Amino acid sequence: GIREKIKLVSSAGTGHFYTTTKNKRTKPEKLELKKFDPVVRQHVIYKEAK
Amino acid sequence: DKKSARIRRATRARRKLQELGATRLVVHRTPRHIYAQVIAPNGSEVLVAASTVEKAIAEQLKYTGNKDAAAAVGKAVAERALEKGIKDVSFDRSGFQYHGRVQALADAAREAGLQF
Amino acid sequence: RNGRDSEAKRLGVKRFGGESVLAGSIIVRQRGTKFHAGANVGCGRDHTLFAKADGKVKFEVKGPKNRKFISIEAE
Amino acid sequence: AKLHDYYKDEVVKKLMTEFNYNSVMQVPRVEKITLNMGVGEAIADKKLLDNAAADLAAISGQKPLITKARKSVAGFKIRQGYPIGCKVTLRGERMWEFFERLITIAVPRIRDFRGLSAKSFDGRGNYSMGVREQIIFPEIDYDKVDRVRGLDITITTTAKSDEEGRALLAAFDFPFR
Amino acid sequence: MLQPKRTKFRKMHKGRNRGLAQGTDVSFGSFGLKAVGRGRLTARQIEAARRAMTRAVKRQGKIWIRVFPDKPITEKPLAVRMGKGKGNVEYWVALIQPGKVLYEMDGVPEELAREAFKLAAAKLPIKTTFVTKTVM
RNA sequence: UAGUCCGGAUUGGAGUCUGCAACUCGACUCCAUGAAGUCGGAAUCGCUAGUAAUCGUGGAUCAGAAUGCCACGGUGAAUAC
RNA sequence: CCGACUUACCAACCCGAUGCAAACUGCGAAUACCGGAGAAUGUUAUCACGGGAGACACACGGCGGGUGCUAACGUCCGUC
RNA sequence: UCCUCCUAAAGAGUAACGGAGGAGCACGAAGGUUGGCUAAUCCUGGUCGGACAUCAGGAGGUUAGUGCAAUGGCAUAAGCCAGCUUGACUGCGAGCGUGACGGCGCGAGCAGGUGCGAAAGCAGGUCAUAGUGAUCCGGUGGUUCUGAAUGGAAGGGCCAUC
RNA sequence: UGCCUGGCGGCCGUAGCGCGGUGGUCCCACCUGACCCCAUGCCGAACUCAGAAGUGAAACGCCGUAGCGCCGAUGGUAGUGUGGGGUCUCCCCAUGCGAGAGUAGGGAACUGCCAGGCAA
RNA sequence: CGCGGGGUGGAGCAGCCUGGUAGCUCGUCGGGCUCAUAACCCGAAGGUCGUCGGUUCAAAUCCGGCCCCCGCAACCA
RNA sequence: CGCGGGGUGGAGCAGCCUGGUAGCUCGUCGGGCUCAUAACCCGAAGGUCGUCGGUUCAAAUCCGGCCCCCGCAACCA
């Protein structure tokens, strides 16, 4: 539909990523949220991916 | 009406407090006076009451109802509470904004020894 | 133009007052908030009232708005 | 502020005998004045409301409160939450200074002025008037403005009847026609 | 023709007609055509009885009709199998029970009303009577 | 170099003269107000000489009442292979 | 222009009076269902696990309804 | 196929080509929390402004609103606004609800670590109930788990995921 | 101990509205000002602080009033489980249960704990 | 009781799919050209886009209730 | 999803080639011209070259990310 799915990958070298949706036709900016990571076992930043 | 509005502001906290069933200390601020009484877990009767209405503490202040005066009763309410044995309580903002007298009152209590 | 309907959600009160339920046991599966939480009972995400601690179910009507409340006497 | 003390004594002692106030606290006092201006046509040009804001920002001594649309009206083509104008509920020291700068040097300045209406009331005691010219003020030099934009001014006092409200405003020598 | 303008739903359940009627005493007029037979009067049956009763006194008096249909009745057309839906709304009826004052009247003698209500009565399927507005 | 001291209609108020009489319906004076209109589509008119173009004056009609009609004189071209 | 006057008529909002409702409720049964305690009665009739099934076209009568025409030894469910 | 109301006979459930309407999403915020606020519709006056733009006063009372259809529900507000933030977090999960089963739903509390608040506490999405398809096969990133003589690799397994 | 008031409740329309009266020594609200903590998506209205000349209108509590809201029997009526009958598209009899509505009437509360004023 | 499409100046037709703006032919009105009409030339007026509600920054446009129009269907015994 | 190649005034295309050149056709307005529409001639307005960033004396062209579009074979969840 309108909202396609993206992949919020972590900031550290660990290959852990969260998936979510985003309205590309409303927001061209990127997503930077903070979430927990099961590998680093701390809280890091999260960059977007596809 | 100014009165009723303040009452429904206290309802949110008061309902949660009796669900927790914690010993709460209500605070009734007044343009010229201050009230604070420790209420039992049944939410029916009180255990320790202290206010500037008691002349024993009133004559020891400049004005009845200002920052240092409200802090004086804070020291007083925590003193009589530890004598009765109550250490752990929960604050009751009671519809007032935690900024002036009510704040210094609780800051005095936390400095007096009231574990909360 | 008709014929369409849905699956019955099995709502309603599961355990009636008097039964000594255990912790976690769902007491009322409702939609709105016909029944409210009292003591030892927590309002669920779907407003599904459940038992937080063991005891017997008790229905009572508190509040000035006369709403139905369910508490739990630790027995 | 100078008519504030003029009020506190001269106006107070005067009305205490007409409506026979058994107590001194039964005297009606001005509470709030509104500096409102709903231009309306800001749905076509966004800079219109800013100049409408700047005009009300010049006459008053504080920022106004830009009001939004309460609903969506298709008759005037305005949707939910759209800027319509701005208001100023000035209640303090400047409100007395605002009263002086209006009834003494702004009232007689209106082009084709003949007097105020003694009928414009709600019934509870609130007077309201509406001027078309914005040139009647001291701050406007006419060189910076470009509109013939007017507004609405309403004074709310703590009275009980409009006949008492007119009595309170009569003490402030209002040229009623 | 009596008919409720734009009601909440179009087609509605048949339902059983039980118990006694609620409208017993003559409220506005001084006379009344209280019913005994349990059944239902269509809008066409009421209007027929309305004209026959209006014409009895010709013009005078006041004539009340405390009964309104408000219960649409469906019917399947000719040459159609069962099922396939609910028939269209043809006529509106009113469920009448024993002890229900259909029509009232005032402004006429007790003699003329005994005649007026007798004529319309033969235009109804139910068995009626003739009562009077009592003392309280 | 702007609808501006361009332009002058409209309209308000005050007056003049004529003639029994100025309302329907007169010309004019005074003050104020002060619009359209920035050379005008299709189309179309007159003129070759002191004519056109442009400016002003006079007379008949007539109590009063024309930008019209008739008449006068001043300034005065271009083009006709 | 302001804008007054009026009507062989209809009708909203309120007051009093009167009815209607599966998709209305400031009220509200009888039963039914759930839990606990006690008596008597019943070859344990209850529950769990395992071997073997059949069956998964139902009919009518009573009561409660949808549908049909409060028609059909009609048709679709509840319950006996 | 899924959701809501009635039919449905006051627990649950209950059919028909019975009666009435919706969904195949949306939002980085409309989420979390802290603190504050709470109308709709009318009567009256008033610049443009007139049935309907704005402001002020009164009556009134939740008929409002609640991202969407309907029902139940909400001012302790779940309705509205603003500040700060990411709990729309990871590993679990006593004990129940609901299904033939697959499966789905609720969930106090526990450990790690986080946001907001003075603190008590609250948060593992949104007032709730639809917004969705099983397996096989294949694709993507990670983890020496294995890897058909040995050391690797391919290919599988497992985690996340299309 | 009683008259008072403020605070936290229990029970929550017999408890709440309309109207009139009344209260200020204490309590409460309004009220003066606002360089500072804080605050208005403007504004010391609200929020907060520093104080308090004065007032008891507004507000709030209390009292009377019942014009409303509300509560509410007894009896009868509707309905109905079970067992029978009939003019069995609806009712009756036996027996157990038993409304709503309306009426007489009741009815503008009651009360627990603490802390001050005041008369003793 | 059905499916698809359509309803737009006086007669009608595009534009909708991919929303902020409405075009075309004949016709109407006035002028012009001719001795006059026609034709032609010139300018202008002329469309609540069937209706109501809603969503969307913008609705003729997207959805639906309703109304009107057209073709096909009533077949085997 | 993968690959190829484009978006250019009101429209399309050339120009992108090997980086320093935005023009042609129709259209608009005015004039010249004919009796008239047209044909024809001259002059003028009309293009962030889809966009951002980078390399560079200079980029619409070269390159990368992004949006949309067209063509292509393929589609054994």
Swiss-Prot record, chain A:
Key words of the record: Methylation, Ribonucleoprotein, Ribosomal protein, RNA-binding, tRNA-binding
GO BP annotations, alphabetical order: cytoplasmic translation; response to antibiotic; ribosomal large subunit assembly
Record-linked Gene3D superfamilies: Ribosomal protein L33
GO molecular function: structural constituent of ribosome; tRNA binding
One matching Pfam family: Ribosomal_L33
This protein's GO CC annotations: cytoplasm; cytosol; cytosolic large ribosomal subunit
Ranges annotated as spanning the membrane: none
Keyword Repressor: no
Claim: Aminoacyl-tRNA synthetase is one of the keywords in the record: no
Taxonomic superkingdom: Bacteria
Quaternary structure, from the entry: Part of the 50S ribosomal subunit. Cross-links to the P and E site tRNAs.
Similarity-based family: Belongs to the bacterial ribosomal protein bL33 family.
Note: Surface exposed on the 50S subunit.
HAMAP family listed in its UniProt record: Ribosomal_bL33
Protein name per the record: Large ribosomal subunit protein bL33
Organism from which the protein derives: Escherichia coli (strain K12)
Lineage: Bacteria, Pseudomonadati, Pseudomonadota, Gammaproteobacteria, Enterobacterales
UniProtKB/Swiss-Prot annotation, chain C:
GO terms, biological process: assembly of large subunit precursor of preribosome; cytoplasmic translation; cytosolic ribosome assembly; positive regulation of ribosome biogenesis; regulation of cell growth; ribosomal large subunit assembly
PROSITE patterns for this protein: RIBOSOMAL_L27 (PS00831)
GO function term, MF aspect, one: structural constituent of ribosome
Any Pfam family: Ribosomal_L27
Keywords (A to Z) from UniProt: Ribonucleoprotein, Ribosomal protein, RNA-binding, rRNA-binding, tRNA-binding
Assigned GO CC terms: cytoplasm; cytosolic large ribosomal subunit
Family listed: Belongs to the bacterial ribosomal protein bL27 family.
NCBIfam families, sorted: L27 (TIGR00062)
Complex and partners: Part of the 50S ribosomal subunit. Cross-links to the 23S rRNA. Cross-links to the A and P site tRNAs.
PANTHER family for this protein: LARGE RIBOSOMAL SUBUNIT PROTEIN BL27M (PTHR15893:SF0), RIBOSOMAL PROTEIN L27 (PTHR15893)
Protein name: Large ribosomal subunit protein bL27
Organism of this sequence: Escherichia coli (strain K12)
Lineage of origin: Bacteria, Pseudomonadati, Pseudomonadota, Gammaproteobacteria, Enterobacterales
UniProtKB/Swiss-Prot annotation, chain D:
Keywords: Acetylation, Ribonucleoprotein, Ribosomal protein, RNA-binding, rRNA-binding, tRNA-binding
MF-aspect GO terms: 5S rRNA binding; RNA binding; structural constituent of ribosome; tRNA binding
Keyword Ribonucleoprotein included in the entry's annotation: yes
InterPro entries given in the database record: Ribosomal_uL5, Ribosomal_uL5_bac-type, Ribosomal_uL5_C, Ribosomal_uL5_CS, Ribosomal_uL5_dom_sf, Ribosomal_uL5_N
Pfam families the UniProt entry points to: Ribosomal_L5, Ribosomal_L5_C
N6-acetyllysine PTM sites in chain numbering: 2
A Gene Ontology biological process term: translation
GO cellular component: cytoplasm; cytosol; cytosolic large ribosomal subunit
NCBIfam families reported for this sequence: PRK00010.1
Family that this chain belongs to: Belongs to the universal ribosomal protein uL5 family.
PANTHER family given in the database record: 60S RIBOSOMAL PROTEIN L11-RELATED
Misc. remarks from the entry: Identified as a multicopy suppressor of the slow growth phenotype of an rsgA (yjeQ) deletion mutant.
Subunit structure: Part of the 50S ribosomal subunit; part of the 5S rRNA/L5/L18/L25 subcomplex. Contacts the 5S rRNA; cross-links to the P site tRNA. Forms a bridge to the 30S subunit in the 70S ribosome, contacting protein S13 and S19.
The protein's name in its UniProt record: Large ribosomal subunit protein uL5
Natural source organism: Escherichia coli (strain K12)
Curated annotation (Swiss-Prot), chain E:
InterPro entries: Ribosomal_uL16, Ribosomal_uL16_bact-type, Ribosomal_uL16_CS, Ribosomal_uL16_dom, Ribosomal_uL16_sf
GO cellular component: cytoplasm; cytosolic large ribosomal subunit
Pfam families, per the entry: Ribosomal_L16
Post-translational modification: Is hydroxylated on Arg-81 by RoxA. The modification is nearly suppressed when E.coli is grown in anoxia.
One GO MF term: rRNA binding
A single GO BP: ribosomal large subunit assembly
Residues bearing PTM N-methylmethionine: 1
Entry keyword set: Hydroxylation, Methylation, Ribonucleoprotein, Ribosomal protein, RNA-binding, rRNA-binding, tRNA-binding
Residue positions where (3R)-3-hydroxyarginine is found in the record: 81
PROSITE patterns associated with the record: RIBOSOMAL_L16_1, RIBOSOMAL_L16_2
Cross-referenced Gene3D superfamilies: Ribosomal protein L10e/L16 (3.90.1170.10)
Superkingdom of the organism of origin: Bacteria
Similarity comment text for this entry: Belongs to the universal ribosomal protein uL16 family.
Function: Binds directly to 23S ribosomal RNA and is located at the A site of the peptidyltransferase center. It contacts the A and P site tRNAs. One of the last ribosomal proteins to be assembled in the 50S subunit. The simultaneous presence of uL16 and bL36 probably triggers ObgE's GTPase activity and eventual dissociation from the mature 50S ribosmal subunit. It has an essential role in subunit assembly.
Assembly and binders: Part of the 50S ribosomal subunit. Cross-links to the A and P site tRNAs. Interacts with assembly factor DarP(YjgA).
Protein name according to UniProt: Large ribosomal subunit protein uL16
Organism: Escherichia coli (strain K12)
Highest classification ranks of the organism: Bacteria, Pseudomonadati, Pseudomonadota, Gammaproteobacteria, Enterobacterales
Gene that encodes it: rplP
